[PDB]
Amino acid sequence: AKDFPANPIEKAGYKLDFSDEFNGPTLDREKWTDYYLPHWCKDPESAKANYRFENGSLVEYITEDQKPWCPEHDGTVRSSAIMSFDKSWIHNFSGTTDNHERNEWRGYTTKYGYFEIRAKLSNTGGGGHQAWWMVGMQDDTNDWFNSKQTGEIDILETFFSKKDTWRIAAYGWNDPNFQTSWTISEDKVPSGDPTSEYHIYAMEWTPTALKFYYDNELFKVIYGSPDYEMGTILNIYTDAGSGAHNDVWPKEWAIDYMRVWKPVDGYKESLNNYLIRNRQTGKFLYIEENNDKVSYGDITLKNEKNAKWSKEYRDGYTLLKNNETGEYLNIENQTGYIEHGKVPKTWWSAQWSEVPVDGYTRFVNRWKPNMSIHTESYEGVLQYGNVPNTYWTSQWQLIPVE
Ligand SMILES: [Ca+2]
């Protein structure tokens, strides 16, 4: 009774583009191959997955006597994987020149959409992890070293030893235009027990961003996204960077389904304006003439124009711009209050991390990463300070408006 209920197959405003309901008892070979990156391995039979279907789920598993998947490149790492493609040169994590030629096959490769699995994670504990991830298909050159279409998104990479987390990561590899340094988090999930229950994990990948959802609620945002087709890998590991195996076998997890939907009206390629409302007070942010602070209050016809905001992005951080004044919110002079001015976009004091919480948004400064935007003194003006994530005076709603 503690599983999160499966979502419906039909999603309002979307069309289903791909699904595997994983009922078994055989893997659908029109969608998946059961070898892990076999082009890296002189003998690809080592890279074959072990798996079964149980209770409507794919159960990938590693046995105690399973051999390493590709000892000449990855040492004694063990993994059982399926992939939605089979293609030369893909995901050269070792930077080897030793590719083994494959006849290109694409079970499912796509650019953009709403991607979702429902899964119950390994309960073995000890070293190891499971992963749902996507890699660029390198369609530009069909090699590695000259490709710039090599992005990696680890939608789920949760470690067996960290039972209350959801690990999410991304890196562009050879791509100069996506996530050129690793970003990795493993925040605690807001509810539930991922290793004893089914939960829903999803990513919406648009031209603008990657947005990650846990049981249908926003959990993480990465601004910036790959702009080419990507393939999917679902796998489980032990004896890898996530740690040496403990003595509980097999290492296994269960995936109920994978679904991908496409928006009926497509995605925006990039003009949005926002009102910004405080969770605790219900008041809106605006800039008053001849006031060096940022005000909050009820929406009125008098302040409406001054209550509209734009977002801009730099280094993956958010800048907040008042539409009427053209000024950025910043903390350069460290006064305890949010300032507004036409300051350089390169100032870290004007750049903010967006942190989803409980259906709302916190803004955390880049220059001073302990400082969030809040109104905990309720002084009629906007503050920054170190206050807990659970304080509603630090939680904000960005509301799109004309
Ligand atoms: Ca199923």
Side-chain angles (χ1 to χ4, degrees), residues 1-9 11-14 16-41 43-71 73-100 102-147 149-162 164-267 270-298 300-301 303-304 306-313 315-320 322-344 346-361 363-402:
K2 282 172 187 193
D3 292 332
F4 195 81
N7 280 332
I9 288 165
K11 185 181 214 289
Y14 290 79
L16 184 71
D17 198 56
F18 177 85
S19 66
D20 197 332
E21 304 294 321
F22 291 131
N23 301 320
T26 63
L27 187 70
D28 187 337
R29 296 194 181 273
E30 288 304 312
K31 298 178 176 165
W32 305 100
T33 187
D34 54 358
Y35 290 83
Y36 182 30
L37 305 168
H39 52 285
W40 299 131
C41 320
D43 164 49
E45 280 329 291
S46 61
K48 195 158 185 99
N50 293 304
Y51 60 94
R52 62 192 192 265
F53 292 85
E54 178 173 347
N55 195 49
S57 290
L58 169 71
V59 178
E60 295 183 322
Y61 63 88
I62 306 171
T63 58
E64 191 174 345
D65 59 354
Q66 186 161 323
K67 300 194 154 67
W69 75 276
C70 209
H73 292 305
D74 210 18
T76 52
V77 171
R78 295 184 275 177
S79 179
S80 282
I82 65 167
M83 312 198 301
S84 76
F85 63 92
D86 184 0
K87 189 169 184 277
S88 288
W89 290 110
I90 299 303
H91 188 67
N92 200 358
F93 57 91
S94 75
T96 184
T97 49
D98 279 359
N99 180 73
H100 308 274
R102 312 283 304 161
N103 295 327
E104 184 183 350
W105 170 87
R106 308 170 78 102
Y108 186 67
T109 53
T110 203
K111 176 181 63 191
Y112 310 136
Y114 194 95
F115 295 74
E116 179 175 301
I117 70 172
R118 178 166 183 268
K120 173 161 66 189
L121 307 190
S122 180
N123 71 0
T124 57
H129 72 279
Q130 52 255 303
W132 171 27
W133 47 302
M134 300 180 69
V135 293
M137 289 300 306
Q138 295 165 219
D139 287 319
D140 53 347
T141 57
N142 307 303
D143 74 13
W144 172 261
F145 291 105
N146 301 291
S147 183
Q149 302 188 346
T150 52
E152 177 177 355
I153 304 165
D154 303 310
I155 307 163
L156 184 145
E157 198 184 44
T158 304
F159 287 21
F160 302 164
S161 72
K162 299 174 186 176
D164 56 359
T165 64
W166 175 12
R167 187 170 173 113
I168 296 161
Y171 179 52
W173 293 91
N174 291 346
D175 188 352
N177 302 318
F178 175 64
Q179 204 52 59
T180 55
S181 302
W182 272 102
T183 182
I184 306 161
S185 60
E186 53 196 358
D187 296 338
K188 293 184 181 87
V189 299
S191 56
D193 195 45
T195 66
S196 70
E197 300 160 2
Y198 282 94
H199 291 272
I200 298 180
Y201 302 94
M203 170 187 73
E204 188 150 46
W205 164 26
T206 71
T208 292
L210 311 178
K211 288 181 179 188
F212 300 89
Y213 298 85
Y214 178 78
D215 291 349
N216 301 330
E217 180 177 87
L218 185 63
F219 178 80
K220 186 175 180 174
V221 179
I222 294 172
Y223 285 105
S225 78
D227 66 340
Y228 36 81
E229 293 203 352
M230 295 178 90
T232 295
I233 304 177
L234 282 160
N235 69 338
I236 185 163
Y237 294 83
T238 192
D239 299 329
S242 50
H245 63 273
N246 72 3
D247 296 318
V248 183
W249 294 97
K251 317 304 179 185
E252 55 187 35
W253 68 320
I255 308 139
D256 179 24
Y257 64 76
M258 176 184 159
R259 295 179 193 153
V260 187
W261 294 266
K262 297 276 188 166
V264 295
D265 293 320
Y267 291 119
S270 174
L271 286 185
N272 283 14
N273 300 321
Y274 302 89
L275 298 173
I276 303 175
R277 189 184 208 187
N278 191 264
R279 183 180 189 178
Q280 174 74 347
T281 65
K283 310 304 187 191
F284 289 87
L285 302 187
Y286 69 98
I287 292 177
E288 195 180 30
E289 258 178 79
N290 289 295
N291 195 332
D292 64 2
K293 304 241 168 47
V294 181
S295 300
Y296 64 73
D298 303 331
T300 61
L301 294 172
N303 73 12
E304 191 191 346
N306 307 293
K308 294 185 186 173
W309 305 81
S310 288
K311 305 163 87 189
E312 286 173 33
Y313 308 97
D315 291 335
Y317 292 86
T318 296
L319 295 90
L320 297 167
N322 188 258
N323 287 1
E324 178 63 19
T325 71
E327 297 168 311
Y328 292 128
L329 299 192
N330 72 96
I331 68 170
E332 192 74 5
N333 290 295
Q334 297 185 83
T335 69
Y337 299 92
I338 300 294
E339 301 173 68
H340 53 93
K342 288 186 169 166
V343 300
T346 59
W347 283 10
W348 287 17
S349 79
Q351 296 179 15
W352 305 91
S353 299
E354 268 176 55
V355 185
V357 48
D358 214 21
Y360 294 80
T361 305
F363 293 103
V364 178
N365 194 256
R366 187 192 185 166
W367 188 36
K368 303 292 169 190
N370 283 327
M371 302 298 133
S372 61
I373 303 189
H374 71 82
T375 63
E376 184 56 22
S377 302
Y378 306 87
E379 294 180 346
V381 291
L382 198 56
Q383 299 168 263
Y384 70 83
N386 188 349
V387 308
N389 298 333
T390 51
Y391 274 42
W392 289 13
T393 55
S394 76
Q395 292 186 12
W396 302 93
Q397 218 181 335
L398 265 70
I399 301 166
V401 283
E402 286 179 291

